[PDB]
Amino acid sequence: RQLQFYRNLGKSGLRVSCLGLGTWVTFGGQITDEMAEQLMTLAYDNGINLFDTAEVYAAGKAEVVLGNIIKKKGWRRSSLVITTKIFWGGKAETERGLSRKHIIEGLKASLERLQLEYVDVVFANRPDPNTPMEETVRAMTHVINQGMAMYWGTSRWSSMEIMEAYSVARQFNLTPPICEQAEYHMFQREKVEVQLPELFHKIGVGAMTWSPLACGIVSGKYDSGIPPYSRASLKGYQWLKDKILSEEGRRQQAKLKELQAIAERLGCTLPQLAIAWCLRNEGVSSVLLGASNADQLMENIGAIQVLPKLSSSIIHEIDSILGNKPYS
Amino acid sequence: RQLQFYRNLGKSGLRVSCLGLGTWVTFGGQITDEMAEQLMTLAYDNGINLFDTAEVYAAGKAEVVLGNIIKKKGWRRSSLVITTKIFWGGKAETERGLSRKHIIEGLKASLERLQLEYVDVVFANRPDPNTPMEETVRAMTHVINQGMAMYWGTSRWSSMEIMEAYSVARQFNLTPPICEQAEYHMFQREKVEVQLPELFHKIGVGAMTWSPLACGIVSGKYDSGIPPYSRASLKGYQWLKDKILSEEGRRQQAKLKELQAIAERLGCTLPQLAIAWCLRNEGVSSVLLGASNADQLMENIGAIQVLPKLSSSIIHEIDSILGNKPYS
Amino acid sequence: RQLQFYRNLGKSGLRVSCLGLGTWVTFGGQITDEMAEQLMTLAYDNGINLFDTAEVYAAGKAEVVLGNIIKKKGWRRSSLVITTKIFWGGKAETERGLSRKHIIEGLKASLERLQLEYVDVVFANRPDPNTPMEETVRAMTHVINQGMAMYWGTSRWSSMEIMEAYSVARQFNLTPPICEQAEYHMFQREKVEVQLPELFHKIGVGAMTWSPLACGIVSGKYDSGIPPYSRASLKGYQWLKDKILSEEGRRQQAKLKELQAIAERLGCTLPQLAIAWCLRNEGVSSVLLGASNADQLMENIGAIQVLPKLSSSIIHEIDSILGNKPYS
Amino acid sequence: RQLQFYRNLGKSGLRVSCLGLGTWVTFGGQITDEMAEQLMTLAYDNGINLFDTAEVYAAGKAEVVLGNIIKKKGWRRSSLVITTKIFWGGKAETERGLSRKHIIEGLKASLERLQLEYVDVVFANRPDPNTPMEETVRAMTHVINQGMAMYWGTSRWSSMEIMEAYSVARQFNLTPPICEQAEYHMFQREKVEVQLPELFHKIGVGAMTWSPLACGIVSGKYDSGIPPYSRASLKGYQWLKDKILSEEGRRQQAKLKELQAIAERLGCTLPQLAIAWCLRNEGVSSVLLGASNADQLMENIGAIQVLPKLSSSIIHEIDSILGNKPYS
Amino acid sequence: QDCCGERVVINISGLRFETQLKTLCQFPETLLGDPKRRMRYFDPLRNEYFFDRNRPSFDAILYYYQSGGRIRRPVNVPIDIFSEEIRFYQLGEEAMEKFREDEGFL
Amino acid sequence: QDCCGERVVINISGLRFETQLKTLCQFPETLLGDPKRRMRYFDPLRNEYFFDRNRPSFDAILYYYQSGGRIRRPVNVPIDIFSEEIRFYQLGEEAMEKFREDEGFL
Amino acid sequence: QDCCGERVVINISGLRFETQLKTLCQFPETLLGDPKRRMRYFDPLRNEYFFDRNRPSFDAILYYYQSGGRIRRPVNVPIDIFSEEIRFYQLGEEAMEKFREDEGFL
Amino acid sequence: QDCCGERVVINISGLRFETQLKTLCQFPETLLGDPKRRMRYFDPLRNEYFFDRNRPSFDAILYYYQSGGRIRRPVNVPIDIFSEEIRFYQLGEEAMEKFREDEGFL
Ligand SMILES: NC(=O)c1ccc[n+]([C@@H]2O[C@H](COP(=O)([O-])OP(=O)(O)OC[C@H]3O[C@@H](n4cnc5c(N)ncnc54)[C@H](OP(=O)(O)O)[C@@H]3O)[C@@H](O)[C@H]2O)c1
Ligand SMILES: NC(=O)c1ccc[n+]([C@@H]2O[C@H](COP(=O)([O-])OP(=O)(O)OC[C@H]3O[C@@H](n4cnc5c(N)ncnc54)[C@H](OP(=O)(O)O)[C@@H]3O)[C@@H](O)[C@H]2O)c1
Ligand SMILES: NC(=O)c1ccc[n+]([C@@H]2O[C@H](COP(=O)([O-])OP(=O)(O)OC[C@H]3O[C@@H](n4cnc5c(N)ncnc54)[C@H](OP(=O)(O)O)[C@@H]3O)[C@@H](O)[C@H]2O)c1
Ligand SMILES: NC(=O)c1ccc[n+]([C@@H]2O[C@H](COP(=O)([O-])OP(=O)(O)OC[C@H]3O[C@@H](n4cnc5c(N)ncnc54)[C@H](OP(=O)(O)O)[C@@H]3O)[C@@H](O)[C@H]2O)c1
C-alpha cells in the first residue's frame, strides 16, 4: 500500500507512489554507475515513479549519472516524476541563495546536466533571510510559466514562512507551493506530527519525508560496533560516528533490540517496520529511500506487506517502548 | 441550412458549419486510408470545415491518418477547424486525468502526431474528481497563451461543473470555456433540452452534439436482424448487439417504421429527417456525423433540403409518436 | 511644420511626422515598382517616417513591394514606422472578422509578406458585430505581448465602440488603443470636428486622417471633364466618375475655383492649401497622402510653407465660401 | 569593508561589492584594449563583481570591448553583475526616449553588441517628459518577463518621479524599480543626503553613486596647473578645464590641501579618504570608480583599510573644513 | 433545487452583499428566490446581479431571508420608500401584513 | 444624447457609487448631468470620477436622481453642510425650494 | 502563541474587516481567538474567514476586542439579535453580565 | 512642501478613505500632516496607511481636515471614545477647546 499504490501529492493533481529513490551519498560517490543502473531498473520494475536529486550532491555528478541512465534505458518521460533542489551552486557570492538570478541560472544548469527539458517539482532547499518573499514567489512563478517546471515546493521551512509564501501568492495572483520536505523517523517526531497537519487541513500542503532509517541507525547494524564499508566508516562522516559511539546511542540500540523483538513477532524485519511506521497516517504522501546495493532495496520494498498489519495495540506498544511521543 | 450555412460556436467569434465529420471507429480501424481520403475530399468540397478527433481513438492512428490527408491535399490551415479531446493517454498512472502535466504532455503528443502547430478547440473528454478546478483552468489558459490552441471546451460535464469553471475563471482573471459536447438523438433528449439553454442564455456556452443516429439504430437497417459488415457485427461491440436484440429494440423498430412513413410522406429518407430534427432549435450549433462509405455521407449531407420543411404540426406528430418529451 | 516636424501619436510616446505615405491604388496596381521605389526614396529623404498599408490592397502585392524596397535600400528598422490593417483575408468564412484566430493568422501572414519581425501599429479596419469586444481586446493584447506589434488602434469605429474597448481594457487589466483613422477633407467635416476631441481630452486617443484631397477632387483637375490616366478613368472606379459627373460636382467645382483664387492670392497651389487646412488644429496628428508620380509628391510636400500663413480671417473666409461648418 | 565585502542592492536579493568599475571615457576612447583587459583582470582578482556601461559611450565601442574581454577570459556568467543604461540610440527621432519601441530595440542592440543573453540591471538614463509613466513601467516589466533582464532602476530622476513609478507599478500589478544612480562627492552632497533616505526607508530603493573624485578634481593633481595626458587636456573637455581654472577652483584646491593634511595624518592618501568618505553611511550600496592605468586602480582599491578608521571626530573635522553640510 | 454551497454576489448601486444560495432558495416565490425572475439582472463580465435601487433598504431585505421571515424597517428609511421596496422584491402578502402589524396603524 | 446602458462609477473620498448614464442625463442642467462640467473630475487610470467631499450627503444626492426629484436630508447631516452640498452639485432653484419646504422654516 | 504581526481578514456578508492576530488572541476562549474553532470558516481561494450573519453587530463585536473588553450595543440593533450574536461568538459569561449591567434591566 | 496632486489611501480596520496630500498638509503639526510621524504606519505591499482603530470616528476626523477645522462628534460615538481619538490623532489643544465648546459642559 506504498509502492504501486498511488496517492496525490498534497491536494494537487500529481499522483506519486509512496516509496521513492534518493540520489544522495551513493550516486556519483560511494557506488559505481552499473550498480546505480541496477538500482534504478529494480525500482522502476516494481512501480516506483519518484526520483529525487539536488545540484549540491557530488557537484552535479549525481544529476549526470541520473540523466545518463534515463537516456540509456529509453523510458518515456510521461511515466516519471523527477525533482531537484536548489540552494548552493558555487563558490562565488552570487551563486547561492534564493534570488531571481540564481534560481533561473541554477535551474538552467541543472536541466543542462540532466539532459531534460523540464522537471516536475523544483524545491527551495533552505530558507533565505537576505531575499524578500515576493521575489522568490515571482521567480518560481516565472520558471513555471516558461515551461521549465510544473510545480514547486519548500524544504526545511517553518510554518510561518510557508503561510507567508501562500499569502504573498494570494495577494499578487501568483502560484502557491504544493509540498514540503521534512525529516521524519522514530527519533525525530515533532514537526511532522504537530505542525504540518494544520497546514494540510488549511491550505492543502502535503509532506514528503526523508531519512526514514536515520542514515542506517534504525536498521540495527551498529550494535556491535562500526562495520567496514558503512556510511559511518566513510571519510567526511565523523559526526555520524560520534553520534553512534556516544551515550545516547547505547539507549537507542537497546530500544532497537526491543523493537526488533516486536518486528520478529510480527513476521518481518526491523527496517520494514521502521519504514512502514512512517506511512501509518494520511498526512504523509511519500517516503524517500536510500540503498547501497540491490539486496537492501529488495528488503526495503517489502514494507508494503507489513503496512496493513499495524493495529492500534502495536502502535501503542511501540509508543510505550520509544517513550518520546509529542504532546498536542 | 446546416452545411455551407455558418453560425457562431456559442457566443464566440468562431464560425463553423452545422455538419461536421467525426474520426471515430472508421478512421484507422474499420476503413482504409483511401476511403478516408475520399470521405474527407467529399466533405471538404461541400463546405464542411469542422473535423473532430481524439487521442484515444485507435491509439493515435486516427490522428496520424488525419494529419496525412491534410498534408497530402495541400489545403490552407486558415480554412479548417480541427478539434482534439484529451483524457486517456497511456497505461501509466500519470498518463491520465486533467492535471497540468498530462494536459501539456498530451497536447504536445497530439500536435506531434497531427503534424500541426496548433488546434482550434481542445476538449476535456470527461470530468476529473482527483484534480482541483483551478489547476485545470490554469493549465488550459497556459496552453492557450503559449499558442498551442485557440479555445477550449468541455465534454460530458454537468451544469454545476461548467458554472464552477466559469466562476473560477472570473475569480482569477483566466479564460472561460466556450462549448460543450453532449449526446443528442431521438431517444436521448433530456440534457440538451432541459439543462443547456439556461447556460447558453446566462454565460453563452453553446452545444456541439454527437451520435445523431444512435450508432446506426435510427437509420433503420436493423429491423430484420444483424446484417454483415455493420458496427454491431464487429468485434468488441457486443453491448450494441445486446441493446438491439433486447425487448426495447423491438418497440424502437416499430416507432422507426412509423417515423419512416412520416419521412416518406415528406419526400425524403429516415436518416435525413433524424439528422435535421437535431438542428431545429437555435441552441445547437453543429452536429457531428459518422460514415463508412461515400454513399452514406452523400445521403447524410442531404438533410439541408429537409430542414426548412419542418413545421410545428410535423414536430407535434413526431412528439406524439415518440412519446418521450421531457417536462419543463 | 508637418513633415520633419514631429509630434506624439495621441498621448503615447511614439513620435511621427505629420505627413505620411499611403500604399493604396498605386502600389502593386497602377504604378510600377521602380516608380514606387522613387516615391519612397523621395519621401524618406525629406524626413517622412510613416508608411501605411493593408492586407486587402491588391491581395498583398502592396505589402510585397513595400517589403522589397526596405530590404533593397538597407534602411535601419529603428528609424521607420510601419502600420498594417486587418479585416479581410480570403474567401473562406473563417478568414474575415475580428476573432482571435483571424487576428493571429492575418498578422502572421502580413509579417511573412512584409519580411519583417514586427509592425509598429496594427489597426482593426472596421468594427465586427459578430465578435465580443473582450475577445478582440484580449487578442490584441496577446499579439502585443508576443512581440509581433507595439501598439494597436481602430479604424471607422464610433465613439461608443472606442469607449467600450477602453472600459473592457480597464476592467480586465488589458491594453487600450491609442489611435483612430478617420476620413477628413473639406467636404467631410463632421466626425473629426465634433466627436473625436472629447475622446482626445478624456482618454487620450489621437487621430490619423486619410484622403485629404477626396481621391483627387479637391486638387482641381476634373473641371473640364475626365482626363486620361486618372483614377476616375480606371476600371473598377465607376462610382467616383458618377460622383464627379453628377449635379453636386458642379457646385463643388465652382467652390474649388473660388478656393483656387484664395490660394493663388496666398502665393501657393490649391492642393497645398487643401492639405495644410487639415492640420490647422492640434487634434490631428498626421495626414496620409497619395501620389502617382514624383511631381505630385514634391508639390504635396510643399504645404509646410503655407501652414503658418493660415490666420483666422482666411479660415473664416474659407468657412464662408464652403458653408458646411458643423454646429457644436 | 567595500570590495570583497558584499551587501544587498537596496532591499532586493542581489548582492554586490561596494566598489565597481565604470566603462566611461577610458574604454574604447582614451586607453587601449590591452590596458582595459589588464584593468578588468585586476578588478576581478580582488573580488569586484560589478561592471557598468551604457549604449552612448563611444557609440557602443565600450560595450564591444567589454564583451570581448569576458568572452576571452572565460569567466562564468553567474559570478558577474553587468548593467547598461538606455536613453540615446541614434540620430533619428524614434531612436531616443523611453517609449516601448526604443526600450525593446535598444536593449536588443546592446545585448547583441555585448554578446550576452541578458543583463542584470537595466537603467533609464534620464527622465522623459514625452512618454506616460505607465508605458515605461509596462515596457520594463515586459523586458524582465521575456528574460532579457533581471531588474531595473532609474538614473537622474527626482523623488516624485520614483514615487509615481512605484504607485503605477502597485496600481497595475507591475514590477517596481530597485535602484537609483546619483552623483555624490565632497562638493555635491544635497540629493543623496536629504532626499534618498526617505525613499529607502519607505519603499526600499537603494543608491549606487558615481563620480567620487569629481572627474579627478578631489584627487589633488590640478594644484599647479593642467598636466599633460589628463582628462582636462583631452579634446571635447573644455568645460572641465574652465571649471578648474576659475575662481572657485582655487578655494577647492586650498580645501583639498587641508584635507590632504588630514589624510596624511591618518596614514593614507587623499583619493582613498575621498572614496571611503562616500561609504560612511548605510544608504549607499556601491561606488563606481574610474581609472586610466593600473597604479590608479591599485591605489583606489586601498580605501578598504581606511574605511574603519573614520570616527565621528574626523567626520566633524572634515565637515568643519568643507563647510557645505546641508540642513535637514 | 439543491441550492448547495454556491455563493451569490448582489450589487446594489455599488454596495456589495454576499450570501449562499440555500439562504435565497428558502423562499422560492420571490424575485431573488426564483431563477427565472432574477436572470435578467445578471452581469456576465463581473459574475454578479446588479440593481440600480435604494441602498439602505437591502440590509432589511437580506435580514428577511437570513432570519427566517422577520420584517423590520430601518429607522432612517420612510414608510413609502420601504413599502415600494417590499413591493418590488415580491416578498408576498404576509410580509406586507407583518409590516403593517409591526408599524402600528395596520 | 441617448445615454444608453453605459455604467458610471463615482468615487466620493473612497466610497464608491454606481449608476447608469440614463439616470444621470434626466437632469441635463446639473453638474453630473452635463458632460462639459463633469469632465474635469475624470480619472483616466481608474475609469471613475473622484470628488474629495463629504461622504454621508451623496446618498441623498443620488436618491434625488433615482427617485425623479425628491429631496430628503439625512438625519445625521446638519442644515448648512447639506445646503453647501446642494449648492455645489448645482441641482437648481426648485430643489432648494423643495428643501426649504421640507425643512419647515422656508 | 506569539500571534505576531500577521493580518486577518474577516468577511461578514460582503462587508470586510481587518485586524491583527495579536488583537484576536488576547481572548483565547472565544470563537475568533481559538484556531481550532475558526478553522471551519476559512476560505482558501480568497484568504479570509466568511460568516453569513448579521452585518451591523460586528462593529460592536470587533470593538469588544479592540477596547480590551467593553460591551456596547449599537442603537439600531435590538436586544434579542445582539444577544444571539453574543451567544454565537462565544464571548463568555462576564460579557453577558456586562451587557445586562449596561442595558439596565439585568 | 508642495503636497501637490498625489493621492493618499488610509485604511481604518478594512474601511478605506481617500484624499489628496494638500488636504492633509494644511495642518503640519498633526499625525497625518507630518511625514515623520505617519511613516511607521505605511504598508509597502499595498501602498496605504493602516490603523487598527475605531471605525465610526474617522469620518469626523477626515471632515476636520476637509472643512478647514470644524469639530463635530458623531451621534453614535460616546464622549470618551471620541476624546481618545482626538488625543491619538494629535489635532492639538484648540481642537479640544472647540470640542468642549461644542459639547456644552466645557
Ligand atoms: N530535503 C533535504 O534537505 C534532504 C537532506 C538529506 C537527504 N534528503 C533525501 O533523503 C533521501 C534519503 O537519503 P537517506 O540515505 O538519508 O535515507 P535512509 O534510508 O535513512 O538511509 C539508509 C542508509 O542506510 C543503509 N541502508 C539502507 N537500507 C539498509 C538496510 N536494510 N539494512 C542496513 N542498511 C541499510 C544504506 O547504506 P549503508 O549501509 O552504507 O549505511 C543507506 O545509505 C536522499 O536520497 C535525499 O534525496 C533530503
Ligand atoms: N464527446 C465524446 O465523448 C464522443 C463520444 C463518441 C463519439 N463522439 C463523436 O461523435 C461523432 C459521431 O460518431 P457516431 O458514429 O456515433 O455518429 P452516428 O451518425 O450516430 O453513427 C452512424 C453509424 O451508422 C452508420 N451509418 C451512417 N449513415 C448511415 C446511413 N444513411 N444508413 C445506414 N447506416 C449509416 C455508419 O456505419 P455502419 O453502417 O457500419 O453502422 C455510422 O457508423 C464521432 O465522430 C466522434 O467524434 C464524441
Ligand atoms: N482607414 C481606411 O480604411 C482607409 C481607406 C482608404 C484609404 N486609406 C489610406 O489613405 C491613404 C491616402 O490614399 P488617397 O489616395 O485616398 O489620398 P488622396 O491624397 O486624397 O488621393 C489623391 C489622388 O489624386 C492624385 N493626386 C495626388 N496629388 C495630386 C496632385 N497635386 N494633383 C493632381 N492629382 C493628385 C493622385 O493620383 P491620380 O492623379 O491618378 O488621381 C492620388 O491618387 C491611402 O494610402 C490609405 O493608406 C485608409
Ligand atoms: N548615471 C550616469 O548618468 C553617469 C554619468 C557619468 C558617469 N557615470 C558612471 O560613473 C562612473 C565613474 O566615472 P568617473 O570617471 O566620473 O569617476 P571618477 O573616479 O570620479 O574619475 C576619476 C578620474 O580621475 C583619474 N583618476 C582616477 N584615479 C586617480 C588617482 N588616484 N589619482 C589621480 N587621478 C585619478 C582618472 O583618469 P585621469 O587621470 O586621466 O583624470 C579618472 O578618469 C563611470 O564609469 C560611469 O559608469 C554614470
Q: Which residues of chain B make contact with C135, given a CB cutoff of 8 A?
A: 12-13
Inspect the structure and tell me whether chains C and F have 3 or more CB pairs less than 8 Å apart. Answer: yes
Among A90, A132, A172, beta carbon nearest to D11:
A132
Compute, in angstroms, the gap from residue A119 CA to the centroid of ligand 2: 41
Tell whether ligand 4 has an atom less than 6 A from the beta carbon of residue D271: yes
Q: Kindly list the catalytic residues of A.
A: 57
Q: Which residues of chain A make contact with B146, given a CB cutoff of 8 A?
A: 147
- Helix, strand or coil for residue G23? helix
Instruction: Enumerate neighbours of F (3 or more CB pairs within 8 A).
Output: C, D, E, H
Out of B88, B122, B192, B215, mutate this one to test ligand 2's pocket (max ligand atoms within 8 Å of CB): namely B215
Q: Which of B137, B162, B170 to mutate to test the interface with E (most CBs of E within 10 A)?
A: B170
Q: Is D6 exposed, middle or buried (0-12, 13-18, 19+ CB in 10 A)?
A: middle
Nearest residue in chain B measured CA to CA from C142: B145
Instruction: Enumerate neighbours of E (3 or more CB pairs within 8 A).
Output: B, C, F, G
Strands B284-289 and B19-22 come out as parallel
Task: Name every residue in D having a CB less than 8 A away from some CB of F.
Answer: 134, 168, 171
- What is the nearest CA distance from F23 to chain C, expressed in angstroms? 18
Among E17, E63, E75, beta carbon nearest to G14:
E17
Q: Which of F10, F13, F83 to mutate to test the interface with H (most CBs of H within 10 A)?
A: F13
Compute, in angstroms, the gap from residue D62 CA to the centroid of ligand 4: 15
Cell numbers that stand for G67 in this block: 477596547
Cell numbers that stand for A301 in this block: 520494498
Interchain CB contact of G63 with A (< 8 Å): no
Strands C121-124 and A179-181 come out as unpaired
Look at ligand 3, atom 31, and give the residue with the nearest C-alpha: C296
- What is the nearest CA distance from A199 to chain B, expressed in angstroms? 18
Element of type H or E holding E45:
none
Distance CA(A116)–CA(A123), nearest Å, equals 17
Write b or e for each residue in B126-143: b if 16 or more Cβ atoms lie within 10 A of its Cβ, otherwise e: ebbeebbbbbbbbbbbbb
CB G91 within 8 A of CB G30: yes
Q: Which residues of chain A make contact with G47, given a CB cutoff of 8 A?
A: 166-167, 170-171
Interchain CB contact of B251 with C (< 8 Å): no
Nearest residue in chain B measured CA to CA from A149: B101
CB D82 within 8 A of CB D120: yes
Taking an 8 Å cut-off on Cβ atoms, the answer to whether B166 and E47 are in contact is yes
CB B189 within 8 A of CB B161: no
Element of type H or E holding B122:
strand B121-124
Distance CA(C176)–CA(C159), nearest Å, equals 14
Interchain CB contact of C127 with B (< 8 Å): no
Cell numbers that stand for B44 in this block: 471538404
**Helical segments of chain G, H only:** 21-24, 58-66, 79-89, 94-102
Compute, in angstroms, the gap from residue A23 CA to the centroid of ligand 1: 9
Q: Is E40 exposed, middle or buried (0-12, 13-18, 19+ CB in 10 A)?
A: exposed
* Residues in chain A whose C lies over 2.5 Å from the next residue's N (breaks after): none
DSSP at C205: -
Distance CA(D212)–CA(D2), nearest Å, equals 14
The three state secondary structure string of D58-123 is: HHHHHHHHHHHHHHHHCCCHHHCEEEEEECECCCCHHHECCCHHHHHHHHHHHHHHHCCCCCCEEE
Interchain CB contact of E59 with G (< 8 Å): yes
Distance CA(A210)–CA(A212), nearest Å, equals 6
Compute, in angstroms, the gap from residue B213 CA to the centroid of ligand 2: 7
Q: Which residues of chain E make contact with B133, given a CB cutoff of 8 A?
A: none
Phi, psi of E75 (to 5 degrees): -70, -30
| DSSP calls for B238-305 | HHHHHHHSSHHHHHHHHHHHHHHHHHHHHTS-HHHHHHHTTTSSTTEEEEEE--SSHHHHHHHHTTTT
Q: Which of D87, D88, D91, D93 to mutate to test the interface with C (most CBs of C within 10 A)?
A: D93
Tell whether ligand 2 has an atom less than 6 A from the beta carbon of residue B24: yes
The H helix count followed by the E strand count for chain H is 4, 4
- Which atom of ligand 1 is least distant from the CA of A214? 20
Out of A289, A295, A299, mutate this one to test ligand 1's pocket (max ligand atoms within 8 Å of CB): namely A289
Amino acid code (one letter) for F61: I
Report domain extents, chain A: 1-328
Q: Which residues of chain G make contact with E59, given a CB cutoff of 8 A?
A: 55-56
Q: Which-ligand-closest: CA of B50?
A: 2
Handedness of CA B158, B161, B165, B167 (dihedral sign): positive
Resolution of this deposited model, Å:
3.4
End-to-end CA separation in angstroms for chain H: 36
CB C25 within 8 A of CB C231: yes
Instruction: Enumerate the known binding-site residues of C.
Output: 23-24, 30, 52, 125, 155-156, 181, 210-215, 221, 229, 231, 290, 292, 296, 299-300
Of A13, A41, A31, D199, residue with least CA distance to A21: A41
Look at ligand 1, atom 10, and give the residue with the nearest C-alpha: A210
**Helical segments of C118-195, H only:** 133-145, 159-171, 190-194
Taking an 8 Å cut-off on Cβ atoms, the answer to whether F6 and C163 are in contact is yes
Torsion of CA C120, C125, C127, C131, to 10 degrees: -70
Distance CA(D159)–CA(D12), nearest Å, equals 19
The residues pairing with B179 across neighbouring beta strands, listed in sequence order, are: B206
Please tell me whether D290 is known to bind a ligand: yes
Phi, psi of C38 (to 5 degrees): -65, -40
Element of type H or E holding F96:
helix F94-102
Report domain extents, chain F: 1-106
Q: Which-ligand-closest: CA of C125?
A: 3
- Which atom of ligand 1 is least distant from the CA of A53? 47
Look at ligand 4, atom 21, and give the residue with the nearest C-alpha: D215
Please tell me whether D277 is known to bind a ligand: no
Among C8, C77, C150, beta carbon nearest to D100:
C150
Please tell me whether D231 is known to bind a ligand: yes
Cell numbers that stand for B200 in this block: 447558453
- Angle of helix B133-145 relative to helix B159-171, nearest 10 degrees? 60
Of A60, A108, A98, residue with least CA distance to D77: A108
Nearest residue in chain E measured CA to CA from G77: E74
* Residues in chain D whose C lies over 2.5 Å from the next residue's N (breaks after): none
Strands D121-124 and D81-86 come out as parallel
**Strands across the sheet containing G42-43:** G15-20, G7-12, G48-51, G42-43
- What is the nearest CA distance from F38 to chain H, expressed in angstroms? 18
C184 catalytically annotated:
no
Cell numbers that stand for B290 in this block: 459518422
Interchain CB contact of A150 with B (< 8 Å): yes
Distance CA(G3)–CA(E93), nearest Å, equals 52
Q: Which-ligand-closest: CA of C294?
A: 3
Cell numbers that stand for C154 in this block: 481602430
Interchain CB contact of E83 with G (< 8 Å): no
In order of C193, F5, F35, the CA distances from C198 in angstroms are 10, 19, 10
CB A213 within 8 A of CB A247: no
Tell whether ligand 2 has an atom less than 6 A from the beta carbon of residue B141: no
Other C-beta atoms lying within 10 Å of the C-beta of residue B9: 23
The residues pairing with D51 across neighbouring beta strands, listed in sequence order, are: D21, D82
Compute, in angstroms, the gap from residue B237 CA to the centroid of ligand 2: 14
Cell numbers that stand for A216 in this block: 542506517
